[model samples]
Structure formats: C-alpha cells, structure tokens
Target: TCPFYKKIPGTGFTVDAFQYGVVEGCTAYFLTHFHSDHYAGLSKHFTFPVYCSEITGNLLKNKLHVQEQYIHPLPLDTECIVNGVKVVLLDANHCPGAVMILFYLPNGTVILHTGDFRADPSMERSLLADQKVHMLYLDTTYCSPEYTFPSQQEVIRFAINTAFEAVTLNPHALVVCGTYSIGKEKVFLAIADVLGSKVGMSQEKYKTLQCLNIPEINSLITTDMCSSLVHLLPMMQINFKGLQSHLKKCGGKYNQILAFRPTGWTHSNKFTRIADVIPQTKGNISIYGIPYSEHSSYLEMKRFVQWLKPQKIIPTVNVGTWKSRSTMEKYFREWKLEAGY
Candidate 1:
C-alpha cells in the first residue's frame, strides 16, 4: 500500500501509484522507477502508456518485456507535458535508473514524488531552489531515529575494502558478496577493478548492467564462477544455509568460503562504527555484514524534509502502517517548530 497517485483536477493523467496492479481508466500513467515493488503488475502486455526515465524505460521494455510504444522515455532535468500537467524528472540517486518525479499541477502547485531515493545536493540545487513544493511523497524507508547508517559512497568503499580484506585473508577460498540484481553495480565493478579480476553474474543480471554502457562495467560480466576469485550473487541468495550448501558442493577445492553482505539491516537494532566489519563464523563460511544502503538514514530524512519545508509529507514505504501517519506528523511538527538549523 505504499503506492501514491493523485488525480489532476482537469487532466485525466495519473502518475506512479502502480504497486499491485495498473491504474486503469487514467488518460496517462507515469512510473518513478523500475523496482519490482513499485512496478508490480506492469508487463509488456500493458494497456496504458508509461512515462519514465530513459534507463527505467529500457529496463521495462528490455528486462520486463513491456512494449516499447507503451513506455516513453523521460530524461532527467527535462520537462514534458503529459496531458495538461508539466512533469520533470530528477535523479533519485538510489539506483541506476531510479528518479524523483515532479508535477506542475494546473493551479501552479508543485508536487514531488521521490520514488525511493537518497538525498543528493545536486538534486536540491537543480530542482528545489526557490521553488515552493506543495506536497511531497517521500521515501521513508529508514524513518526511525535509530537507523543512522553511513552514506552510500562511504559504504561502497567499506564494502570494497572488506571484500579485498576477506579474499586476501583467505586466498584459497572464494569470496562471495551479496547484491541486488538491479542496483549496487558500483560495488561489483569496484571489486573487479581492485582485484584485477572479472565478476561472475547470470546472463539476465549481465544484461541489466549492459544498459549502463560504461566501458569499465563491461569487464565485470562473466558466466563462470571459478574464472574470478570473487563471485557476486544476489543478496537474498547469500544466507548461512546457502553458503554451507555451496561450500559442500565445492568440497576440498577451497579451504573455506567467505561471504559478505553490504546492507543497512546489519545494524538493525545496534549501532556500530560505519566501516567496522561485523563477523560471524557459521558452518564452513565466515559471514561478514557491512552497513551499506541506498536509503537515507533517519537524520538525513529529517534534514531533507526540513530543507524542503513541504506543507505535507507522505511517507512512501510506511504509508499503510497505523503509526506511520502520526509519526510523520509529529516529525514534521518537530522539524518546523523545534529543530534548529
């Protein structure tokens, strides 16, 4: 129920809000990003036209098999008219193709839908300067004060250093790192460049990275696991049991396997030094979890909302929860009245 969309007073266009299924009956539709949660029921056989960033458009049409005619490319920082509403795309900084959407309503009111993003200074200067935002749909993924995680750049560096350390420590063993199929390519590429070895990924995953078109990234795609010292697998696939099974299959080929998971959930309840490695030995694998995330920490979210000073804040991730609305209202009140700049 994190989906959000508003009907233009006179125009029949609707933007985003397509979580479970397509928003039928609208004159036009827009997608903020290509993440599965936000693009749940979209398909190549879609009925309505979708407007999104060029990368997102490519992902939808190329990966998800959406029809090319139905998906329109909306480049960043450029404004285009959808029906009567003027819409602009801003880089979301969460993933490769993710973007924040801004809509200029008929009454001259500006609405921003931040579809899963981390705060960036460039985005604020480009889109938020001197503009009065009327309503804001925010990415409140880490909305609690306890979720004070490090920046993505810092986390990426930590992950790279940790991977190198792990492989260096266990030369005979293979280093396996966890990541999503869509995002976190930077970590994979960095590891490949640092280790001077290509990465192993599935054809499907490789195809997604191909859209980035970076020459350095082209070196990270390989089908063979043994071809490289490190094997980059999906984050969901790097559990304790999975690693144990993988090690068993490898038999005596390697001494011991090391697994690293870069995620914000590593510090779910306990705070730790940003790049400090937290280790746990289980079965035949040594598991290390690093605090890496694309979502902003609670303090960052507070500062972003305060800086924008929107009239209303809609929490995207926790929208359906009972306490979410009240918590956001309380935060907004504190931000406006109590929080010092």
Candidate 2:
C-alpha cells in the first residue's frame, strides 16, 4: 500500500506524495527516488516543482518525460534553503537516486523522510545525526518482528556462492536472476563476475541500468542467447512457467537452469537461517528465492528507531487500512525506547 499521509504533516512540502495529485498545502514537491510507486502520478503536463537527487531528476526526464524546468535535482550531504525551509539530502541505500530528505523548519523542528531504504547503520553518521529530530517518516515495509532476515550483504554473498556452486558443477547451465525497475544490480553483477559470463536483459532494463552509472555494467551485457548464461529477467519471470518458457525462448541450448528470485518476501520466520531457506525445483529448472531486500528488516528498523529516538515516528508503508497500520504501530512501541513498555 502507498503512504497514508498525502502531505508531510506540518511542512508545506509533499514527499513521494505525487499520487494524491496536488494537495492543499503542498508548496514544493520532493521525490525521494524514481520508483514508480514513490514517484507515481507525476506527468508531462504537471507544473509542480520537484526537488530530488540528480540521478532521480535525470530519470524523471529520461523515463517519465516530465518537463525539465519543473525538476530541481539536489546534491547529497549538502544543506540548502528551499522556500525558506532548511534542507539536506542524504544518500538512501535503497535504489539508485534514492535519498532521505531532511528538513529543518524555521520553527526549529527536524524531520527526516526516508522514501524507501535499507536502513544502513552508516546513515547515522550524517550531518544532522546529532540534531533533535522531532518527526521521522520511516519506510516500515518490514516493521514486524516476524519479518527478520539477513543483511543484503549476506544475501548477496549467498547468491554468489550458490550460483558459483551450481554453475561450476554444470558448465553449460543457464543462469537467470530477477530484478525490479531498479535495484539488485549488485546481485546480478557479482554472479556475472564469478561465472565470467556476460548478462542478458530486456533492452529497457539495459537502458535503466545505464542511468545508475554502475561501472562496467554494459561490458557484461549481451542480448545474444548463446553469449551469456547469466540473464537478467524481471521478477515476474522467476516462476516455473516463467523460466520454462524463457529457457525455450532462449534456443534451449542449456538444459539445466539456475535462477535466482531475489526479494524480501522470500524470507519468512519459518526459515531460521539463510541456509534453511531452500529453492523450489521443478524438473531441470530451479528458482531460489533469495532474501535480497532494499527495505530494512524488522531488526534493522528497530535499531534505527532506537538510535535516532525521534519524538514521533510516522510509518509510510502498509498504512492504507487501520488494522494493518495498528499492527505496525504496536511494533513501533515495542521497538522504540520512548514508545511504550
């Protein structure tokens, strides 16, 4: 579900709030990243000014074709004034061009709006990390205790080692990895490097990857079916029929397929460790669900909330219904020191 809050409370600025169209008090629009879910509702004819990271701003023009004059790309780790409000953008370790918009009101209030992030610990060492942040707009995608999983680094290595093991055993095995509109490049890049194989992907995904400025990403990409075993497929194609048809479509040169389905939803409390989470294999095709998430896990969110100690915590995900929102708010009080017993 999208964020329940249309306009960031107490600020005339709307963040990732484009889907609501133009809210009453929205004086300036700030986009945290280029994810359609977050940057949804922005159109060519829209005239509202958008403030975002340079990479995010570029994508708006390149992908969405939003007018240039309306886009304002900001630099990370630098403070500036916008409509009289003090502001700074910090690198959000979510997707490319993602940043946490930090605001300092003339009333001396601090607000940090994390669009969607992995909640890395290094983020705490920022310029305003010492300030008294009154309100925190958190990405609570995985806020419950049951959603715990390993770090992205752990998952990345897991996918690499697993793929290396499978590929080495079967030299001609076809490798497929799932991706979103963005993200999971590290997983795709690492697998290609270890196997010394080029990558295959849709032309549009290749174009999107270029916006990320990932070093040597293009050198590893080839559309030829015989050129590369490591092919980047959309998450929708990570299924049995999905990979089955994909293999047939790729000329069926390779019999055994090693596919990775990387997403947070793959991890459940039923699996204790990353090792316990197994792959689903049908015939010669196997699709392993890797717990590689861009959003923070439950434990990571707890760590961030406790450390930051913001006066108020506002969740930006899964809040469309009161029942769902209440469950998460209960989680907040359990984790944050000042929330509850």
Candidate 3:
C-alpha cells in the first residue's frame, strides 16, 4: 500500500495500491527514478504501465527484484504515452539513473514531478527545448543550509586517498564503509583510479549490476590503468574473514583491511567525521566515515529553487525532516515576509 492516506470520496478516487488517494485525479503517476521509494509500491496490484528511464527499468527488474514485465522504459529526452498520458523524461544527475518526469496534460497544463533529484547545472541544458512548464513539484530534500553534503567527485577523491593512506600508516588495520549499491560504486572506481589497479566487488553486487546489462565494472580494474584498487563483493558476516584471506593471496605488501560505507549519517557529525576517515598510517581498524550522499544540501536546495524561480515550490521525501523543513519554510517566509501584503 502507498505510505499516506489523504483520501476523500467523490474525487473520482482510486488508489495506486497506496493507503490513500490525496492526488486522486493524478491521471499519470510517473516513476521518476528507481530509488526504491519512488517505485516500491508500484509493482504489486497496480497494473498501470509505470514509466521511467531504461536504466531505471532495468534496475527495477534486475536490482530491486521487481517481477514486472509490464514496465514501460522511457529514454532520456524522449516523450512517450504512459497509460494515455504524454510524459517526458529528463536526466536529474542526482545519480546515473535518476530522472525528472514531465507530464503534459491535454488541457495544456504541464506538471513537472521531481523525485528526490539533485540540482546538477548540466541537466538544465538537456531539458526539452519547446516544453513550457507551468507547475513544478521539486525535490526539496536539502531545502536548507543545515543539510550540506560533499560533491560526488570530491567525496570520491576523499575515499580513495584515505584508504591508501590508511594502508601506509599501519600494517594491519581494517576499515569498513557503507555505500549504496549503485551510486557509491563510483567512489570505489576513484579508489582504483588512484591506485592504478582494478578494485574487487562482491559476487552479488557484480551479479546485480549484470541484471541492468551494465558491463562488468570489475573488468575496468584489470589493466595497469586500473590495477591499484581492490573491491570486495558484498559478503555475509561469516564470509568476511574468508574473503580477507582470499584477498591476501593476490600479492601486495598492504595487509590491513580497509572498508568504507558511502554513507556517514550514523555519528551525526557528517562533516567533521568525513575528514578523519581519510586513509592514514599506524592505526587500529578504522571505519572511515564519508558523507557521500546522493541528496542535495540545504544551500544547494535554496540555490536550486532560486535558479529555477518557479512560481510555487513543493518539498517531498523529506516531509518529516524537521530541520530541513524548518529551513525551507524559514527561507520561503522571508521572501513573503517582505512582500507588500
């Protein structure tokens, strides 16, 4: 069932298998990206030909373990009819597979629905040149300065440099980190780029990526161009020790185990802990913290809204995020506060 239940009868109501029908007249439910929250409730019971990018479609069918042959995959910049609605998909750049869906209604109202998107300036150029957007529902996730996060490339460099430094400082320190199954792989790739060796990844991740028809990312690390980095496939706790021993067989003076999770929300100090996690020498096992998130920060959110200058702005996904919401509302209120009411 859908998460909310804001339904009222007589609005031509029906649910998308969700508990409520607030947006009941929503003729088209666009699946903006494959980040679980956007597509989780769609497959079961709801037979609408859900729409998303080809990559998102593959991810749902392959990675998310969704069993739906009824999916309709839309390509970047292409417009298609979904359950009789003309919809367009545009790259959102929050991740490789994230997108924003534009719904063009017959009555000439264009609704732009953004699902947890990041503000990548590069994306503006890819928008459909002729479409005039009337209303935009944006991803105001980091709608305040309080929710800052490092850039993707910056975070990657940090993760790589730290891991290598950790090995040099100590001979036998282990490091573990958390990263999302999809976007965080880029961080590992950067680590390999630094070491000039291919990194290793787990079999399950390797297989999951294959489901999306993506080429084996591991293969890129095999040559001198990518040999210094190593990736361990996802492992059950019982199997980590065996995997460590297997990694030792490959021949290198580095003996410490260093790992990172692409996320750093656990300790609450996402900013300060990130720098500490950089690879270092002479230490016990370190679980380096990297606040490498896919969402935008508060200032970025403000910048996004200011740049687009939409007539109205709506924040989603972070509805209950108190600090973020407060920041967004505070900023919005300041503008209205000065208006000649």
Candidate 4:
C-alpha cells in the first residue's frame, strides 16, 4: 500500500484512474489556484493537509466558505516539509491568486508544478525565469500558440470604452456582460474604478474582491448600480416590467442595464435568450461584447515556455480525458513549434 495519501474516488474508487491522493501517515500537501478545474476536488474527497499560496488559500476558503482544520495557508517562497519533500510556493498570476508549487526531493531532483498558470509578463516572467526548475509540470490548458487573450490593458480599455459609449447613448441602459463569479471580479472593480460609479456585483463577487483587498469604489448597491446608468437594470431578483416602469417615469428614459454573465454565457445559444428578454424600446440598447479572458493567451503561453526554458516541460492539469487531453495536446505541440529562446 502506498504510504502518503489514501485515494478516494467519487464513484467508490473501483477504477485505478479515479483514485485520489489523501495525505495519510505522511506529510502531504495540495497546491491549488482560482480556476474551478484546479481545486474542485478538494471539498469532495481530498482529506490531506492542504498548502498553497495565500491568494489560492483565500480563494479556496471563499469557495468552500469553511475553514478546514488541516488546511494551512502559506506565503510565497516559504519552504515547508510535506511527505518528506521540501516544497515552496510561487506566484503564477493566472488569476489574481493563481500559484505553482516546487517540490524538492532530498537527492536534489527538483519537481516543479505550475497550477493553472498563464503567460502574463507582469505575472509569470519573474516566477519562471528566476527559479531553478528541473522538471516542470505546467498548466497546459492553453498550450497552443494560436490561443490568445487580449492584453489586460487592452481588455480593460475595451470593456470601459464600450460601457462608456453604451451609457452615453442611453443614460438608463442595461448592459449585460458575461463573466464568472470567482474570475471576473477584478474586471468589475476595474469598471467601477474607471467609471467612478458602483457596478452591479453578486455577494460572492463582492466578498471575493474585498478579500483580495480591492477598495469599494462605489456604494454596495447591486440593482441600483445596473439601473443607475440605464433604465435597463439587473432585476435578477424581479421581473423587467418594474424596471421598464421605473425608466418610463424618468422622462421616458433610456437606461443601460449591465450584468456580467458568470457561467453558460460562452455559448451563443445561452446569450441569445438574454437578448430576447428585453422588450423593443425606441432608445438604442447597445450590447457590447468585450472578449476578456483571465487566462493567458496563446502567444503568452508560448512566450512563457521559452522564457522558463525548463529542461523538459511536462504540461499538466490536462486530466488526460479524451476530449480535454486532445484539446490540451494541440496546445502542447504549438509550444514546440517555436524554438525556446
């Protein structure tokens, strides 16, 4: 029997593939990130003592909303012994609190695991190039050089510009953008900061942002934030008729209601239904789509691999299922397409 962890698969652990790692009788630690895919298994069956970057620990705490007795939060670069291996945490910056772990074996073989990291210059460059990594387990989610995300500056600019323009056209408007609860919290803060107004955010989002040390740019009002700019406000709690009536009273006002869709917004089928909700109004109802993803883009990942220059890059977090691995492999090959500079 293996010593450190007890594997607990969700479906009774009959299959060798589904066996999970539980820290038992030995020091074991779990590294995590903000992405749902990275740390989703913790609450279900992972019973070992968990160790991760402060941001990641905070994220997990917020996610589970429960402080486990064994979960320990550590700062970056802090060394600790787990399962006879010396480990250190590093900043990954995939999201605000993303991280990677470095496991040092007694014999000097260094094993590096990057937890859902992206290639953002402000984020990854320092972590990758500065460290002495031997074997690297990378976040192979977007390995293809073709996959790309707009620069943070670009994304911020586009979101703000579009929102500004929409609000200008119709003072009272409901502008709904798509975003995730954990992920897009920063973008909403950015919008609030730039526009100098309160933006509509869920309780989960507001709490997460507050934990991340973001100042409250405007009032904590949720529906008013959406309705303040436009007649179309986020009435997730109620129907649209109330909003319509509210706008009608304000000089036949045209309002822009802005909502950042968390999940299921990636598909056109999902987004189309939202548009149907709005009754035809004389005022221009602008729906500006800002393609802002928190993960690193294609070129960004390629550039990071080259910068790290690890001996053999082992892209992980792929889970190696049929469809997910197939998609992940395409990205891995793209990294090799360009010479590691």
Candidate 5:
C-alpha cells in the first residue's frame, strides 16, 4: 500500500498530514513545502505545530490565515531541531520556497525527503557529498525513461524563441505565458528581461511574488493589460473558458493572442517524442506546450539515486498505486552501484 504518513519509529512526530492522504496522529508536524498537495488538510483549525520554509510560513500565515504560533520557519542550509529531530532545509528549485528536507533521527539514521524538486548538482556537492542517507523519499513523478525532457535553461530559450516567433508572425498579437500561481516565475522574468517590458500578473500572484522578495519580479505586476505585450497568467487561464473570458473582457481590441505552457507532459504517448515546443491553435489564439519541468526526468532520477546511494527508496506520490512500486524497482534495478550499494 502507498504509505502517506511515516512514523519516526520511536517518536510521536509526523511528516505531512491530511485525512484524505498522508496522515498520522501526532503532537508535532513538518511540512516540506507550501504546495496544496503537500499541505493537504492544513487549515485554520490546525492545532499541531508545523515547520516549513520562511516563505512558506509567511504564505501560510498571511494568505492561508493560519495562526502565527503554529508555523515555524525552517532556515535553508542550517540545522535546527524540531521535536528533538535534527533537521536541515535545502532549496528544491521547484518553486520559490520549495525545500528538500534532511532529517537526523535520534536513532542515528538520516532521511531525505525531496518534497518536490529538480535535482541540483551544487547542492549535492556542497551538502550531501559526504552524507550517508538511510532512506530517500523521492518525487518519482516521471520515473520512466520515456519521460525525457530538456533542462530548464534550454526550455526557457525555447519558450522565449517561440514567443518571439509567434509575435513576429502576428505583430498585433498578445503573447501569454501560462504558469502556476507560484512556480515558473523564472520563465516570465526571463521573457520580460528580453522583451524590455514588464510582465503583467494578477494581483494575487503579484502579492505572492512580492512576499518572496525577488527584485526582478517587483515591478512585473500591472492591472493594465495593454501595458505589456507579454502577459503572465495562471496556467489554467490558457484554456477555452479562460481565453474566451479574457478576449471578451478586452472587447476584441487585441484579437490575436498566443500562449505558451511550459510543461514536460507535451507528448501524446510514450513512443512519440515531442519537440521542445508543441504548438496548437484554438480559434484565433495559438497555444504551445514547452518542454519545461521542475521535476527530475527518469534519467535524472537514475543519476540522482546513483549519487545518493541510499539504502532504501520510497516514492512519495501514488506509492503502491498505479504500479509505482514496480516501476521504481525496475528503474533502479538496472543501475549497478558500488558493491554494497
């Protein structure tokens, strides 16, 4: 079965809690990130003390309206004790406040929980080079060889080039970049920097970015749609309803619009390979799904496991469901590590 809540063996604390998902009765808790999936069941009624990144804590307190005392800030690259468990936080590179947690249990065992992250070579070299991990909780979202994707940098270049090309094809068109509420800000910022104009974002998104204290993102939010040729909108905003509503609001002033959704799931099937950018047309709008992702592909996961050499690998998502266990085992079995590993 897919295990959601994991016990500390001899302790009472728990990691992640939701009645519908990972849940354990505990006196204290640790949240790896602020994503809704990771923080399921968390609400104003939550009474247990929770530990997470400072930015996440701020979002929880300010946006989610969670009480201040219940939230604890986990500083990056620093070891702190929570409920007698030694813990350290590392940048997950998935989002602004996303973190991969390193935990040192009292039983002389180390556990790494990659909340949701793209692998980072520098972090591996700096923090995990000499470390011995007993268990690894991996984000095996794309643990199949068929899910190969280009690097974020390459996808960024592709997205920018595609957007430029789309605009060049229709000079009067508005280029819309689709993204989640928190992630893919880098894409928007990069496009804005290149186009020499600010990216317009919703007020809620702007507030969230402002809380992150990123300088480049500070002046990117605007209520004026005409202020920027490039508009940064929530990924769902590119759909039929969203597009129609937006166009109607604009009163057909700019009927030509292009959209780009930077995601790794661009191909129709495992056997088919998609280009860096996949384009489609809906009415007068063009939409492209760029091969960009914040998670590690199968090849990247293989390389990561070889580097970490953990004793056991436990996938954090879908666990036993959807043949996840079998898939994980098959993938790792092909890689031969050191004699004992």
Candidate 6:
C-alpha cells in the first residue's frame, strides 16, 4: 500500500500527502492540483509551507478561503528554490490551476510527480531537452489498456453535437450539465459557446468560476436561473431523480430536460470501452453519460511513458493494494522493453 503522499527519497518534500497529518521530517508539502482528493487535509490550521501553481494558489485563497502566508505560488516552466531544492511547475492540463511538480535535488536526482493530469502531446514542450527524470510518480487512474477513450476535443465535440441535436429537436429543452466543484469546466463551456447561450449555475458555482480565470468564462455564465437554456449543476443533481427535483425547483421552467454527467468512471471499464455511453431516457428527461475524464487514457499514458523513459515509474493511484499496482507495473516493464531501454 502507498502512503497518502509519496515522499521523494533524499529530500524533505512530500507530494500531495497532506491527509493523515504531517510527517516528522517534512519541510514542504506540494499540491499538484486543487482537486479534493489531493487537498484533503489542507486548512487554515495547517503548519509548514504548501507549494502549488499560481492559478491553484488563487483558488485556495479565493474559493477555499485558505490563508496566504503559507501558500507558495510557482510559475509555470520556471525553476524556484524551495527549502534549498529546485522545483518547477508545468501545466497539468487537468484543471485551471493543476500542475506537474518537478523536483531537482542536490544529489543530481530529478523527480517528476504528475498530480492528477490528462496527458497531452502539447505538454512535451515543457520537458528540458537533455534532462533525464530519475523517478516518476504517475497518476495511474487509467494506466491499463481497458480504460481507453477518445481525446478531450473529440469528447467535447461529441457532447456539443449531442446537446445541440437535442436542443434543435426541441428548442425549449434545458441543457443541464453535471459538474464537480472544479473539474470538467471545458465541456460545459464548449456547449455554451457553440450554442451561443449563457451557462446557468448556482451563485456559489458562479463565484468559483470567477476565481478560475477561464477565458471569457464570465460571458458564458450567469447565476440567474431563468436566463440560459444550459444549466451547470453539482454532481449530486445529475441523475434523473435529482434532475426532476431540480426541475421542480425551477418551477417547471421548461418542457423537456437534456442532461449530461461527464466523467471517466461512467466508462472506466474496470481495468474499462472505446465507444461513448448510451443515452438514458425517462419521460421528458434525457441524460447522457459521456467519458469526459481529466486523467490520461491507457493509449495516452503509454505514449507519455515511452517518450519520457524515466529510470523508475511509481504508481500513485490504485496503489492501496500491492497486486493492483504490480498489474500496472507489468505494462510499464513491457513498454520499456519495446523501447529498447
């Protein structure tokens, strides 16, 4: 089993390991993103310095109400000295404030920790040309072959077209989107842009979006319920029953409802499918479960691992059990063999 945070050997820094409290030797705590799982035990009462990207720092201060003195905001692609160790922040492409924490120890050890991220070829530019990463801490959510799905752009287009078709068929239908507090902002944003309609959300969500600094996000979203046909809501209200309750709250605002629950687990396929999820219909409500995952798919993970060729790959998720992690390691070994490394 893995500890809450993966401690880098020969250093006092720990990556994403705030929960279960602080360890004895920890000098710095690193947060790869603003997601709940990563930021579990971080609070105003916390001790020690917390390091993160600038955008994530904004969310912690504005949305989470965490204190500022302890927050260290690192710029993207720039190296900064933390507790005498060199650290660099790179775009995670997972969320607005998400980042990959790269550490360089004085002993010539280079460590890369991918906080939860969606691997993209565009991110390759950030890697220094001749530097070799000694150890890689990976987000192994979709490391196996079964968790394959299409690209984010493709999924966004699919969601946009699907929502568009439903709205076109019935112009008065409400396009409802399920959202986490942070993730999946792009999917709904795309829907609002392509449809040329303002996105509606709770006043709380509007406040959170304002802090994210998403491009023209203000133009696409409004807190007024009756204004827009597209409604972005919490995950709890994504189901048919919840949607019905919400519709009731809207005072029977529209005739029919077209809802989307965009997440990877909807199609994770256990180890998980290539095709999009089938639409579910009940009475006037239609819900579509699209694979809008923030983590990399198996195909993307393979490509990234091959290109990086780290000296050792460390599995971060699904590591609570010994065998499950080894199962993923099997692929890592195979990929290394194929690369002739």
Order of quality (TM-score)? 6, 2, 1, 5, 3, 4
lDDT of 3 by residue, 1-341 (tens): 24332111222222222223334464434565655555545544554445567877777676555556556677778767665556677777666667876767777667666666667666555664465666557676555545766677777777777767765577344334344456555776666566555654455555555545446654543333113345544433213454455446546645555766566344454446445545332333234446776776665655555555555555565667687667767776654444421
* Cand. 4 Cα-lDDT: 0.52
Better of 4 and 5 by TM-score: 5
List the pairs of residues colliding in candidate 5.
none
Candidate number of the best lDDT: 6
- lDDT over C-alpha atoms for residue 110 of model 3: 72
After the best TM-score superposition of candidate 1, give how far the Cα of residue 29 lies from its true spot, in angstroms: 1.7
lDDT of 4 at 228: 42
The residue ranges of model 6 lying beyond 4 angstroms of the native Cα positions read 1-5, 265-277
- For candidate 6, write residues 1-341 as lDDT tens digits: 22734888888888888786757788888888888888887777775788988788888888767789888888888878888888888888888889888888898989889888888888776764458988889989988777767677878888888888878888878989988768888888889887889999888888888877677767889999788989988888788899888888777668888898886754344532334456688888888878777899888888888888899988888988888978988999999999976
Q: What is the lDDT of residue 333 in candidate 6?
A: 92
Question: How do the residues 23-94 of candidate 4 rate in per-residue lDDT, one tens digit apiece?
Answer: 233344455565554454556344555666666567667666536555567777667765555667777665
Name the better of 1 and 4 by TM-score. 1
Instruction: Looking at model 1, report the run of 10 residues with the lowest lDDT sum.
Output: 1-10
Query: Residue 140 of candidate 3: its Cα lDDT?
Result: 65
Q: Hey, what RMSD does candidate 5 come out at?
A: 2.8
Cα lDDT tens digits for candidate 5, 58-158: 88887778999989887898878777778888888888888888878888989888878787677667576767998888888888878777778877777
Clashes of each: 1, 0, 41, 27, 0, 3
Per-candidate Cα lDDT values, in order, are: 0.74, 0.82, 0.56, 0.52, 0.74, 0.82
Off by over 4 Å in 1: 1-11, 19-25, 248-253, 266-269, 339-341
**Candidate numbers, best lDDT first, in rank order:** 6, 2, 5, 1, 3, 4
Candidate 2, position 169, lDDT: 92
Q: Candidate 6, residue 151: CA error in Å?
A: 0.8
Tens digit per residue, CA lDDT, model 2, 188-302: 8889988988887887877777777567766878766578889988787788998898888778588888888877665364556886667888999988877777889887888
For 1-341, candidate 1 gives per-residue lDDT tens digits of 42334443345566565654544556677777777777777777786778888888888878889888888887788878877678888888888888888888888888888888887666668866758998888898888777776677787787678767766876787777787757666766777777778877677777877775457565667877667767777778788888777766655677777777776655443746765556788756787777667787788877788788888776667767678877867777788785453
Q: How does residue 132 of candidate 4 score in lDDT?
A: 65
